[PDB]
Design an enzyme around this catalytic site. Structure first.
Site, short mmCIF file in Angstrom:
data_model
loop_
_atom_site.label_atom_id
_atom_site.label_comp_id
_atom_site.label_asym_id
_atom_site.label_seq_id
_atom_site.Cartn_x
_atom_site.Cartn_y
_atom_site.Cartn_z
N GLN A 128 3.37 -6.96 -0.47
CA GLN A 128 2.58 -7.73 1.09
C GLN A 128 4.27 -8.17 1.35
O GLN A 128 5.05 -9.36 0.07
CB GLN A 128 1.67 -8.24 1.61
CG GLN A 128 0.48 -7.31 1.67
CD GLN A 128 0.01 -6.55 1.97
OE1 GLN A 128 -0.29 -5.84 2.35
NE2 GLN A 128 0.36 -5.95 1.09
N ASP A 184 5.19 -3.37 -11.57
CA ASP A 184 4.44 -3.35 -10.65
C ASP A 184 4.89 -4.43 -10.03
O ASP A 184 4.83 -5.77 -10.63
CB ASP A 184 3.08 -2.40 -11.19
CG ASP A 184 2.49 -2.55 -9.53
OD1 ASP A 184 3.16 -2.30 -8.18
OD2 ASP A 184 1.49 -1.83 -9.63
N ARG A 190 -8.43 0.43 -4.25
CA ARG A 190 -7.58 -0.46 -3.62
C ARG A 190 -7.97 -1.98 -3.80
O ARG A 190 -8.24 -2.51 -3.78
CB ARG A 190 -7.67 -0.37 -2.16
CG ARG A 190 -7.12 -1.37 -1.64
CD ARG A 190 -5.43 -1.96 -1.76
NE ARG A 190 -5.02 -2.72 -1.21
CZ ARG A 190 -3.63 -3.32 -1.17
NH1 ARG A 190 -3.19 -1.60 -1.81
NH2 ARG A 190 -2.89 -4.18 0.03
N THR A 198 -0.61 2.87 -8.42
CA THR A 198 -1.26 4.50 -8.38
C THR A 198 0.14 4.91 -9.40
O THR A 198 -0.44 5.99 -10.25
CB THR A 198 -1.11 4.62 -7.18
OG1 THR A 198 -2.54 4.24 -6.26
CG2 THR A 198 -1.87 6.72 -7.25
N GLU A 255 0.83 -1.11 -0.08
CA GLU A 255 -0.15 0.01 -0.28
C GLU A 255 0.30 1.40 0.01
O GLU A 255 -0.08 2.39 0.50
CB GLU A 255 -1.16 -0.16 0.92
CG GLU A 255 -1.77 -0.88 0.89
CD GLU A 255 -2.54 -0.78 1.93
OE1 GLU A 255 -2.07 -1.80 2.98
OE2 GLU A 255 -4.07 -0.63 2.08
N1 LIG Z 1 -4.52 9.73 -0.60
C1 LIG Z 1 -3.65 9.24 -0.73
N2 LIG Z 1 -3.87 7.81 -1.45
C2 LIG Z 1 -2.70 7.03 -1.63
C3 LIG Z 1 -1.70 7.57 -2.21
N3 LIG Z 1 -0.73 7.13 -3.60
C4 LIG Z 1 -1.47 6.01 -3.25
N4 LIG Z 1 -3.03 5.95 -2.40
C5 LIG Z 1 -3.98 4.78 -1.97
O1 LIG Z 1 -3.57 3.66 -1.20
C6 LIG Z 1 -4.13 2.26 -1.70
C7 LIG Z 1 -2.91 1.55 -1.78
O2 LIG Z 1 -2.09 2.14 -3.06
P1 LIG Z 1 -1.58 1.22 -3.94
O3 LIG Z 1 -1.23 1.94 -5.58
O4 LIG Z 1 -2.37 -0.59 -4.09
O5 LIG Z 1 -0.28 0.56 -3.68
P2 LIG Z 1 0.42 -0.65 -3.60
O6 LIG Z 1 2.38 -0.43 -3.13
O7 LIG Z 1 0.30 -1.28 -4.75
O8 LIG Z 1 0.28 -1.72 -2.14
P3 LIG Z 1 0.07 -4.03 -2.82
O9 LIG Z 1 -0.13 -3.93 -4.35
O10 LIG Z 1 1.69 -3.58 -2.71
S1 LIG Z 1 -0.70 -4.78 -1.54
C8 LIG Z 1 -4.59 3.16 -2.65
O11 LIG Z 1 -6.26 3.10 -2.13
C9 LIG Z 1 -4.68 4.26 -3.41
O12 LIG Z 1 -5.53 5.22 -4.09
C10 LIG Z 1 -1.55 8.72 -1.85
O13 LIG Z 1 -0.01 9.98 -1.97
N5 LIG Z 1 -1.79 9.75 -1.38
MG LIG Z 2 0.02 -2.62 -6.17
#
Ligand SMILES: Nc1nc2c(ncn2[C@@H]2O[C@H](COP(=O)(O)OP(=O)(O)OP(O)(O)=S)[C@@H](O)[C@H]2O)c(=O)[nH]1
Ligand SMILES: [Mg+2]
Length: 315
Positions: free
Chosen positions: A173, A169, A147, A17, A12
């Protein structure tokens, strides 16, 4: 030319994103058919969030503000099934709306670090009137806010400034960390994402572990990995928006007991930057290109990615 970017970081942290932003910024953005595909994801994220807040109230022994909500909470579970299939009936919308507005529901919402809750909960819950509308179609921002945990390896392609980017990407986890090594070939640069706001949270997959300490361990291992010596390390200290609001009320000492600075954005943010940059065991020979970001903000990501690109072009 061919530029290979690898997105890394704990769960997360914002990696997926950034991938979505590349489409909005470097392509056409999401088409109508593409946005409608996320409709079920938006509904599922909203339902999950309100349910997580309600699960929490029982665990934490927080009562509803108005007793009538007990009936709404019961009706919630009865109608929840539809939302997963991509439907939001006025009845279910009204149920979630009243529950979200309840004082005890809000009290529990404000203690979310005590449980697990999506960052986009409020975004969707405060915009419930719009998203529940008939013939609702997710906006670009709604898509960006969704998400869904990343399992496997996602590859995206886009052309930018005459270069053909191939962005990878993978899931952050613990269960997914084993898949990271499959991505290790020919990397031009690594964009390591860190959720700045994770400093007072603990791992979804472990209550005893502070999320930022986990992220530092990953960074330490990635930054100093010999295989990556000739790869550019780009550090995105993400979710600067949530961090800005959060630093006002939750002490950074929760994460770094030795933090002596104030509860302000500029001081705290630079402190975290140094915490991560100091893990670089070869400061003199290897550079880290740090940027503060709000992944869900297209303008922010655009200007930052533009700067990042020039660094990849030059160095
Ligand atoms: N408000 C806010 N939320 C963000 C930001 N960047 C990402 N998000 C949010 O956090 C959640 C997780 O981000 P995501 O892009 O899914 O993470 P990830 O690193 O891809 O996570 P994973 O796939 O390893 S489990 C999503 O709902 C996304 O919109 C930010 O800078 N601000
Ligand atoms: Mg992801």
């Amino acid at each position: 030319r061919e530029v290979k970017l690898l997105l890394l970081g704990a769960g997360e942290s914002g990696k997926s994103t950034i991938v979505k932003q590349m489409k909005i910024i470097h392509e056409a953005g999401y088409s109508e058919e593409e946005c409608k595909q996320y409709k079920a994801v938006v509904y599922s994220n909203t339902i999950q969030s309100i349910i997580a807040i309600i699960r929490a109230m029982g665990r934490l022994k927080i009562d509803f503000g108005d007793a009538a909500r007990a009936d709404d909470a019961r009706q919630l579970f009865v109608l929840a099934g539809a939302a997963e299939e991509g439907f939001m009936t006025a009845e279910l919308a009204g149920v979630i709306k009243r529950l979200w507005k309840d004082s005890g529901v809000q009290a529990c919402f404000n203690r979310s670090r005590e449980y697990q809750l999506n960052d986009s909960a409020a975004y969707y819950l405060n915009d419930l009137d719009r998203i529940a509308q008939p013939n609702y179609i997710p906006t670009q921002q709604d898509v960006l806010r969704t998400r869904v945990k990343t399992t496997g390896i996602v590859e995206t392609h886009f052309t930018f400034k005459d270069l053909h980017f191939k962005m990878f990407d993978v899931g952050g986890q613990r269960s997914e960390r084993k898949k990271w090594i499959h991505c290790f070939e020919g990397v031009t640069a690594i964009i390591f994402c860190v959720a700045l706001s994770d400093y007072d949270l603990v791992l979804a997959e472990d209550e005893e572990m502070n999320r930022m300490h986990e992220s530092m361990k990953l960074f330490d291992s990635i930054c100093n990995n010999k295989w990556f010596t000739d790869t550019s390390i780009i550090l995105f200290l993400n979710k600067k928006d949530l961090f800005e609001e959060k630093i006002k009320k939750s002490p950074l000492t929760i994460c770094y007991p030795e933090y002596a600075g104030s509860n302000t954005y500029e001081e705290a943010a630079a402190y975290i930057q140094c915490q991560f940059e100091d893990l670089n065991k070869r400061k003199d020979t290897k550079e880290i290109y740090t940027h503060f970001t709000c992944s869900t903000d297209t303008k922010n990501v655009q200007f930052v990615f533009d700067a990042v690109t020039d660094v990849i072009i030059k160095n």
